[PDB]
Design a protein around this ligand. Sequence first.
Ligand SMILES: Nc1ncnc2c1ncn2[C@@H]1O[C@H](COP(=O)(O)OP(=O)(O)O)[C@@H](O)[C@H]1O
Ligand SMILES: Nc1ncnc2c1ncn2[C@@H]1O[C@H](COP(=O)(O)OP(=O)(O)O)[C@@H](O)[C@H]1O
Ligand SMILES: Nc1ncnc2c1ncn2[C@@H]1O[C@H](COP(=O)(O)OP(=O)(O)O)[C@@H](O)[C@H]1O
Lengths: 89, 93, 92
Amino acid sequence: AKPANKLVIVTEKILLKKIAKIIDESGAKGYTVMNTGGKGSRIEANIKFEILTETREMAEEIADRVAVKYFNDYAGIIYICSAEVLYGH
Amino acid sequence: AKPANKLVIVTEKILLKKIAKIIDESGAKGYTVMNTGGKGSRNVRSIEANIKFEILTETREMAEEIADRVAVKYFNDYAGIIYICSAEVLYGH
Amino acid sequence: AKPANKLVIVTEKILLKKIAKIIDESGAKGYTVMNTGGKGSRNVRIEANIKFEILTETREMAEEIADRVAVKYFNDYAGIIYICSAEVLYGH
Ligand SMILES: Nc1ncnc2c1ncn2[C@@H]1O[C@H](COP(=O)(O)OP(=O)(O)O)[C@@H](O)[C@H]1O
Ligand SMILES: Nc1ncnc2c1ncn2[C@@H]1O[C@H](COP(=O)(O)OP(=O)(O)O)[C@@H](O)[C@H]1O
Ligand SMILES: Nc1ncnc2c1ncn2[C@@H]1O[C@H](COP(=O)(O)OP(=O)(O)O)[C@@H](O)[C@H]1O
């Protein structure tokens, strides 16, 4: 097993490509994304990204870049969970 | 960051509005939901047939309140599971 | 509450039934599965994927599922497997 951070970003669907680019530019080795619905504080259609990162710093870089650039104008939440990677490429 | 409980409810898709109502009434500030498939006990019920809710709560007690209400109201008649994970909130409205 | 391991497998959609069989054979009482997209190493393929979530009684059960899936399929198919802590509150 390898300890890891799992970064979750739930945000508006229109940001899909812009957030993917941020994720890639961070050095993250991959991400999972899915359509979801929800309600918060622009059911509404949303997207959820899950990104298992190398380090906490990598997760924080993604989170900061997304939130700073987009969260004043777009709905979203960002949170992190602990995960242990068992198998991967 | 702020520590939080992430409450997960996986249940029948037809309960979407009924569980949302309980979440809203609990004081929780939001939820995420998605369509899923799955198998469990495989007892007769009265993507595919399920929904999965994710609710980041204020407190553990709020999470438990949602869970307790859902289970008492619906889990005798409907499929489902409820669990909680730890999360840290980084950014939010 | 009952402590538990939540095993996550994200892999190719074609493997749905095959992985469900492994999960069932492990003694796991259930699983959740959903359609997702993603990208990774691009070793053998955004692509459409499936994500399983399996709450197991024990760590050993989680590991048995993970080991069987990875050995059987992950040389030849895309995927990742990871585990999170969970506490089960209610269930059938
Ligand atoms: N407390 C929460 N628990 C889980 N998901 C949440 C929570 N708060 C917000 N969300 C998710 O983030 C999305 C965006 O929330 P927010 O930015 O507050 O705006 P909105 O109410 O416009 O959806 C929600 O639709 C939901 O999917
Ligand atoms: N151990 C488990 N791990 C992950 N998901 C589970 C587990 N048990 C049940 N689930 C999820 O909860 C849903 C409801 O399970 P249950 O109430 O046992 O009845 P059913 O067999 O009709 O689906 C399952 O379809 C699955 O999505
Ligand atoms: N670091 C990561 N964070 C989240 N999801 C990941 C990560 N790396 C891989 N994944 C998920 O696993 C799937 C399979 O990954 P991989 O085997 O590297 O192949 P592919 O690049 O063909 O998708 C990815 O599509 C993605 O959904």
